[PDB]
Symmetry: C3
Subunit: 340 residues, 3 copies
């Protein structure tokens, strides 16, 4: 909600209260998303200032508060700053912003990440170029310097993040994306390469000094119709876990496919169907394994721009004898969303 | 303070900064409230959207930030999300919201929870139905479908919360309440029952598979006069600790009595007196023992709807040879509250 | 940014997004400020209500969110409530506020705490009277009861904080400050003394029952010119660490000197240079040793009151053979800041 607009500076204070519960069979240890309350809140601000007729400065912040914790010792469990950056936009030159913002490959992955609750399974947080990540400087250009309508591109530099855990770690990297839109159609390709930290190589699973992520996408977004497809490959880049041996790390190679089909009825209903297959190869001791594999059917009901409820049903295709101990049970989400 | 109201949606951004100090003799280890700085801040949003003439949507979030912590490792000690839910309200049919909201029995306990700082001692956080608690879907209905002015009631369903601590866990449960008000008078009855977790039974104190909490209240609230009385009973639900044996759990049976008397003077002062006695029975190894027992004297001075100060003196009736090692000393609070 | 003004209460919601990166050779520990991503965000409210034509009430809250953390287990590392207090201001009597607020000695140190990124090394967090501290009660008076323009003073009481770390602990104490300004010029003096906790004496470094901090400053702040000079001494108060022995504590005596020179060009540039030397004496086992010693050159370019960028280069004079293992390398900061 824009709550300040004066002297060439505007501040939108946005957020939401999302009441949410997951239902899966048994306890749901062996399920896709789990079982129980998943209620949460978002808060964030978008600030934008007009420095002059061509030049804009801006900054955005966003925090996820969890609401399924007690007021006890676990009060902070799952709270996080999701976004935190600042940047400039100048004429038809382009924009540059630095901080913790989504990685360049998500430019593609965003295409299919449209589901009521789930989906976009391959957009892991702090996972190099496929998701939200600290320490990125990104340059973007719209309509190619004002000469080509619909031609966007971006080059991203990834700063080194040597953390205590291997999962949230990354080396220095470079990435990019190119996208074209014309009359409802959209095509995007994105690729990133990065150094791996020593701490990541010292891990049981995954082998290489270089992580590589690339993805392409197609979409049709018009007349209440949304269709989307993502295909991607990763080299030493998808985080994975062996549930039997209790070891952690990355998959040597993965192939990811996402399909999304949604229709927006005028009366409030937006039924959604989807398909996801993320498969790994060369997982040490295990080899080839499916990390993600499901059909999804769901629907969001929009009361208006501020209120919605949805049901998101994940039909698991993963087999109970999954070599990586991946959950095989189905999971259902029921959400009611106030936002501003 | 309502800081956005446009296109049929309003957002009230409220919070407070409460400078607060506790005074007990010595270390205040052996007292009711403790000794030292207790400064805190609250921040939150109450959002409401008008969907159509009968149907309103809403969502609320609320956070407690502690200010008596350093900027070191304990910076987070006592910060927590208090409220986080979303819901719908339809005509004279009623309202429904899901998430973290006050438990149903609070509808009774709210009558006596009116003190400047302390009081309402039997409304423990994460204690099934008497205080703020995770995972509740609540139906409330005012004036009985619009057919009976003043007759409100509510039914609450409590989701299972298997946490790391027994204190902060709860099983599956259901509760309900009925209140009637007429020309200053108010009467309320409330009752809830719920399953207990394994981790809760594996505690030294308390025996049963079922938690039960009920409370009733009478009150007169008119012409600057506030009177309130609560009586309630609990079975295997009230959290307790043995300070000697260092053992934890719930009391098998408790009886709670709270009286509150306040008058609001027009020149700003609101002197308050209260009495609280919460005693337990069938406490393993001890039997009958008083958990809470004090008379309270205090006064709050309102500068305005945004500024106040108070002094709250707790005269403890608990004896120093309390079988559960409960504090016997008095505690005084000095508060200055800015709010919006 | 003022976002509410109705019925005699105003609420300014302020905060920022600071994209920031640190540059030092190698990993970062043997440097001044470190190496890698340091993006952070602030959020806060300043509230003020008019009770009547003479009496004003106010409250402020301010929080730091870190953005250089992952979304894993380290999500909260470096987040903190910086400010949390409430107070009153009455006519020409003066103002009084309680909570977690800046120490009184900061009234002096503020003259020099003006660099684009670093500087103000003697404004330690939770360090009695030289930095932000919980449980302080301050009375302040401007223009000496309104009779003498430019003559301001403050008296501050520091409440006891028996915490887990000697670094973040403090006993009961008293402090004060007096400042006078005339036609661009300013002079300020401040002094505070306090009891030390048992846990603080039980530390290896530092000897005494009374901690003492005092500091004076001169400044000229007019016609785009900013100059500042600060000199101070501490007794058993500056937190210090032996990097070789992994021992922590306080320096028995410190002498601190700070110089700051800045000029604000009308076209947007504000170059800043500084000098800071904080050296300790009678440090157990070592004796005399330098804690802080550098020359600084940097510049902030202001796009407007909402957007700015800076480069701040620290030239460390600290020796690689520092007896306390204090980093000896230089550090460069690069920042881009949106604020409101």
């Amino acid at each position: 909600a824009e709550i300040y607009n004066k002297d060439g500076n505007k501040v939108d204070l946005y957020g939401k209260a999302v009441g949410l519960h997951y239902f899966s069979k048994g306890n749901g240890e062996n399920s896709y998303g789990g079982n129980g309350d998943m209620t949460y809140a978002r808060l964030g601000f978008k600030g934008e200032t007009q420095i002059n007729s061509d030049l804009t400065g801006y900054g955005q912040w966003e925090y996820n508060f969890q609401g399924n914790n007690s007021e006890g010792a676990d009060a902070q469990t799952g709270n996080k700053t999701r976004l935190a950056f600042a940047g400039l936009k100048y004429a038809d030159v382009g924009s540059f912003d630095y901080g913790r913002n989504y990685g360049v490959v998500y430019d593609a992955l965003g295409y299919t990440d449209m589901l009521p609750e789930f989906g976009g399974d391959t957009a892991y947080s702090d996972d190099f170029f496929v998701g939200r990540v600290g320490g990125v400087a990104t340059y973007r250009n719209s309509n190619f310097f004002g000469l080509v309508d619909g031609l966007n591109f971006a080059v991203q530099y990834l700063g080194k993040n040597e953390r205590d855990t291997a999962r949230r770690s990354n080396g220095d990297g470079v990435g990019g994306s190119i996208s074209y839109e014309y009359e409802g159609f959209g095509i995007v390709g994105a690729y990133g390469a990065a150094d791996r930290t020593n701490l990541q190589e010292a891990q049981p699973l995954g082998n290489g000094k270089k992580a590589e992520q690339w993805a392409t996408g197609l979409k049709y977004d018009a007349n209440n119709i949304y269709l989307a497809a993502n295909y991607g490959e990763t080299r030493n880049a998808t985080p994975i876990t062996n549930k039997f041996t209790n070891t952690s790390g990355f998959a040597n190679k993965t192939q990811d496919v996402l399909l999304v089909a949604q229709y927006q009825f005028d009366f409030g209903l937006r039924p959604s169907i989807a398909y996801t297959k993320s498969k790994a190869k060369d997982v040490e001791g295990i080899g080839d394994v499916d990390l993600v594999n499901y059909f999804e059917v769901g629907a969001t009901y929009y009361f208006n721009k501020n209120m919605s409820t949805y049901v998101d049903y994940i039909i698991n295709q993963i087999d109970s004898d999954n070599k990586l101990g991946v959950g095989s049970d189905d999971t259902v989400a029921v959400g009611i969303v106030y936002q501003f």
